[PDB]
Design a protein around this ligand. Sequence first.
Ligand SMILES: CN(C)Cc1cccc(Nc2ncc(Cl)c(-c3csc(C(=O)NN4CCOCC4)c3)n2)c1
Length: 342
Amino acid sequence: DVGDEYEIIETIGNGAYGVVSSRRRRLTGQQVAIKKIPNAFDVVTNAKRTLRELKILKHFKHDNIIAIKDILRPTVPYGEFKSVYVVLDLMESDLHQIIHSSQPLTLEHVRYFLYQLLRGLKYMHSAQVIHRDLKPSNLLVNENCELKIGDFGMARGLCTSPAEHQYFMTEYVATRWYRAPELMLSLHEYTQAIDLWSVGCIFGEMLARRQLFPGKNYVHQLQLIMMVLGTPSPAVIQAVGAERVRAYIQSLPQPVPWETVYPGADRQALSLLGRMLRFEPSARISAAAALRHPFLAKYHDPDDEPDCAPPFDFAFDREALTRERIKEAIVAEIEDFHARRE
Ligand SMILES: CN(C)Cc1cccc(Nc2ncc(Cl)c(-c3csc(C(=O)NN4CCOCC4)c3)n2)c1
């Protein structure tokens, strides 16, 4: 599995099309995570997502974004190469376990976690990359309370051709809980503000240590969102993609203050929260401006919240590539990685 240069420790996850084990580099002793992606070239959409992920990760160099530390070279003939091994930063837990466990989660924990999330997000949005699928299970953390953003299978970027119908109908299992309203309602406004909606959801979830908008189904999700944010505005309703969603929403009979949603919460925390959770994307705060909000004064540092240049190009992802060309690009990605340190 891991060749001679690593040693396996324990399995961290096995479901889905990947195994995640913790390991140690034999020569250095550094601990890492090894992700096996089996049958990585069978399902064109899977291989596309994988190539997407490898490129996004190789592009980012940022302490709050998981880094690729090694990619195992193909140990079998090209045509026989079917399992991809990606070595990543080993983290100790994820924000979900923290929120839904027996461990401390003080307002200072919440403040520092939010700070690192928004710092990663500032660097990431400056590269024209939208994560689109943020959630506590996607935020990795260690003992010191350091946070790293991961995954990225769902990241897309700023251009949205009439591939908005693609967003119309896609699979989201338990993942509509943080899905931005513009995606729930296909408002055809797909920018980095998407992520900010989720951040708000995550923020409140740290505050009360319970999910904010836990819809049991699509319609229930919309109903929950509305019971708090109040009836959406005329313009929003008119921008909804599917006439049927519009009709249901119009066939419905006010916003509840956030001090009432989270009675007794840090004033500044709820200030930021309210700046995040709004229907109109344009009305949300940017990651950059959030980092300057009073709630984060403890950690704000303008010389240590860098943008990322150059921006990230999704052209490779936009073109329809055969299975073969996708596999070719992934192998080229591995070799390129080994061409930029090891
Ligand atoms: C030590 N342990 C008992 C506690 C624990 C619990 C959860 C996480 C971690 N740390 C960690 N460090 C590095 C990485 Cl990279 C990951 C990781 C999580 S999820 C994932 C992925 O890519 N996909 N997931 C979806 C389905 O397939 C595989 C998983 C990669 N986690 C530690």
